[PDB]
């Protein structure tokens, strides 16, 4: 469940 | 019993015999009265089985191939809600026929010789007649679609930032709430947002289409351009006033008719 928005974040890094 | 054995001499059709069998149902708790009526029960079971098979052939075709989908679409029913309605009325007819066979066979009808197959097939048919999965799939695709209403009231050529198909979602929300489904609250609030802005958006898109249809006429006939430029800049000022407005604004409510009557005046 934590993976979803972590991916949300790492899009531009 | 002799007062009940004149049934064929009174009832000429199975429907009034159904009705008089339903009216006099409580006399059949007595075992002698239950044993007295046996040649009627077999015919009644065969008629109910024929009706159940006929409704099975009604459900043999699907909702897209049915004429009911066409007749619901011509009566402004969204197709998801029309399918839900159609399956629920099929289930209601099945429950009515189960009530009929319970009335005809008396109590303990599920354990009877003929009632066992009827009850088992009714259970297996009602398992296939539920509408939860189609509702869940509709909810998932609505929660995937994201028909938003937020933003400025214009988009650039002149057009209004409003898809007109969002009013279907409001129809499905106001229909599925009637059918006992608990839709999520964000979808209900989006339907509220659509239903609030829909007449104003319709008047906006109609005034914009009127303005461009007369602007084509103005730019086609250039000889009278001096006469009609008095209010062309006025409605351009109205448009530029509405450029700063967004859909969340509460100042659109005077603004829509304040655009509309000027558009009608410029048309006239």
């Amino acid at each position: 469940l934590a993976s979803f928005f972590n991916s949300l974040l790492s899009k531009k890094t | 019993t002799a007062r009940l054995r004149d049934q064929l001499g009174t009832a000429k059709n199975a429907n009034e015999m159904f009705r008089i069998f339903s009216r006099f149902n409580a006399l059949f708790v007595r075992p002698h009265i239950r044993g007295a009526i046996r040649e009627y029960q077999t015919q009644l079971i065969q008629r109910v089985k024929d009706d159940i098979e006929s409704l099975h052939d009604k459900f043999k075709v699907q909702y897209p191939q049915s004429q009911a989908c066409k007749m619901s679409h011509v009566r402004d029913l969204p197709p998801v809600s029309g399918s839900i309605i159609w399956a629920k009325q099929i289930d209601r007819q099945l429950t009515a026929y189960m009530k009929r066979v319970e009335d005809v066979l008396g109590k303990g009808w599920e354990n009877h010789v003929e009632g066992q197959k009827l009850k088992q097939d009714g259970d297996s048919f009602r398992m296939k007649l539920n509408t939860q999965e189609i509702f869940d799939d509709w909810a998932r695709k609505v929660q995937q679609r994201n028909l938003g209403v937020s933003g400025r009231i214009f988009t650039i050529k002149l057009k209004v930032n409003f898809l007109p198909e969002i009013i279907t979602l409001s129809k499905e929300v106001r229909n599925l709430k009637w059918l006992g489904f608990r839709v999520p609250l964000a979808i209900v609030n989006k339907a509220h947002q659509a239903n609030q802005l829909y007449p104003f958006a319709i008047s906006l898109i109609e005034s914009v289409r009127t303005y461009e249809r007369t602007c084509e006429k103005v730019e086609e006939r250039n000889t009278i351009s001096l006469l009609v430029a008095g209010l062309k800049k006025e409605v351009q000022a109205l448009i530029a006033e509405g450029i700063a407005l967004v859909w969340e604004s509460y100042k659109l409510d005077p603004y829509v008719q304040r655009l509309a009557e000027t558009v009608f005046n410029f048309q006239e």
Binding site: - | V74, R75, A96, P199, S203
Partner: protein, 371 residues
Amino acid sequence: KLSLNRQFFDERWSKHRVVSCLDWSSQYPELLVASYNNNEDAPHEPDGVALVWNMKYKKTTPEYVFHCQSAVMSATFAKFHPNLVVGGTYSGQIVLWDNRSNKRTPVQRTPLSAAAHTHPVYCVNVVGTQNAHNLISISTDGKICSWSLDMLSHPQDSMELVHKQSKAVAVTSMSFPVGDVNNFVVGSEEGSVYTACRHGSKAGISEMFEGHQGPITGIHCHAAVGAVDFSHLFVTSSFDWTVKLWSTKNNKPLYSFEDNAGYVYDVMWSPTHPALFACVDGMGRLDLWNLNNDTEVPTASISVEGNPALNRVRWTHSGREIAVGDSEGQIVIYDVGEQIAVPRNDEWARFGRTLAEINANRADAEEEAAT
């Protein structure tokens, strides 16, 4: 007996369209208007289109053709102006057509403002008298506006029909009792008949009428006038495969008619015979119900060839003919026999004994269910 009289179809206009409303002019009893949905095959063709047909002539061509750019699904004559045809469309315009004008474009239309209807309009009607009458239209969102028939750019009165902590109802049908202008009944998509008042301190929806589990598709108040009054009765049709008879003095349905094996679309009373009405289904079977004869079996039922869905049904003012409208677009007209259409002298008295018996049977059934 039930027999075929005439068949109406136009290849250019009526092809691949569903009939959506039927009416017969009171001044010209040989005329019939019609209303059609959009043609999905030809977007270049007009979406809404209205046709006027005739009885006296033998000509298969329609007498007048009217059309509109949006799909019209509610059409009627004007009661006190013979030259006018009122239509209600998908977009919410209430267009007005004139036969004396040579243009098939609508000569007048209401604005698409929030003051007027923006949701589709399925009911349009004219009530009032010769020297005082308005045009009444209710849209699907529950908005009902009154229009003067000479000036159409602004509604006269407007309010929204709400109930249950001011939730908007979804008006799908409409009827008016004979001799009444202020009180009327509506159907609903939410499956419940309401009673409404036009103007007053309780102007708006008055009462629940409960008992339909499906969307109500057609209602009609009683119209036949004789020795004993019957104007408080009306019959509704719905998607629940039932036709239900109601009265305004009862919160519950009087009797449910369950002869059908499909959706039921319209029902309306005979204007002459007091205990006679007709209903249509999704299998083309126009049924006739005589309440003084039997309460569970249609008196005369015939099927349309090819079996399409019959949308609308509408009697004539004479009551000797009856017009149906199918799902492909052919207005099929039947004429009923003299043994069914003609009311006898005791028919009002026989129905005066009939309704009471029906109510008694209903009470018996309900007590049985309770126990």
